[PDB]
């Protein structure tokens, strides 16, 4: 989107969100990133929301088709169309990872921005891992783990236990442990420790920050209820 102003791309990305035009919103934010300037807190959220929606719809479709495909294995069309959706999903994940690698992460010097992008990197490698089956699945899983772990290390050094990004990072890393890494006990332990340390820090927060943190704390509890 090289001929459009950065501010216009950002403004149109907000309009696309309101219109629920998430593919447009992602293309706008991709153009904004490629302007080469760092992203503000709000702009990072727009980037993340745009691609989470796009890849979320692809993941849901992939799961529908993969389930039909496995039932048929109890012509080639079902596998072909699953492969087509799967290829588009991997393309979106590779696109996001390319934005993070060129050059969002290396220019993110603050903990809030660096943890945010590393959380994103873990998420989109996790999405790749969900459909991986061959020689690279283990390497893809380790790339997810490595990204999440570096984000965890920084967030524990640099952010309070109630920080929404720190909480969301831990939530997603615990889903990674349970769903991808076949480590349900690690998943449960991370969610428990994350919830308990946030609980003990709630007294420091304003009413608005209290609302933000307890919302994600509830997601951690929902998983623990499901896992234990």
């Amino acid at each position: 989107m090289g001929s459009m102003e950065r501010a216009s791309l950002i403004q149109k990305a907000k309009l696309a969100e309101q219109a629920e035009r998430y593919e447009d919103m992602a293309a706008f934010m991709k153009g904004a990133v490629e302007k080469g300037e760092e992203l503000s807190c709000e702009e990072r959220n727009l980037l993340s929301v745009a691609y989470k929606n796009v890849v979320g719809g692809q993941r849901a479709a992939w799961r529908v088709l993969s389930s039909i495909e496995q039932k048929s294995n109890e012509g080639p069309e079902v596998r072909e169309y699953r492969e087509k959706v799967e290829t588009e999903l991997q393309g979106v994940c590779d696109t996001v990872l390319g934005l993070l690698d060129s050059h969002l992460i290396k220019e993110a010097g603050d903990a809030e921005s660096r943890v945010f992008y590393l959380k994103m990197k873990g998420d989109y490698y996790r999405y790749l891992a969900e459909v991986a089956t061959g020689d690279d699945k283990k390497r893809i899983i380790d790339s997810a783990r490595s990204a999440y772990q570096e984000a965890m290390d920084i967030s524990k050094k640099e952010m309070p236990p109630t920080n929404p990004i720190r909480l969301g990072l831990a939530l997603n890393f615990s889903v990674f442990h349970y769903e991808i890494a076949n480590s349900p006990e690690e998943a449960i332990s991370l969610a428990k420790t994350t919830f308990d340390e946030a609980m003990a820090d709630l007294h420091t927060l304003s009413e608005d920050s209290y609302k933000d943190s307890t919302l994600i704390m509830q997601l951690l509890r929902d998983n623990l209820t499901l896992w234990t």
Binding site: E42, V49, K52, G168, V175, L219
Partner: peptide, 8 residues
């Protein structure tokens, strides 16, 4: 459940 993260 992961972060829904689909609304800003």
């Amino acid at each position: 459940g992961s972060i829904p993260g689909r609304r800003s």
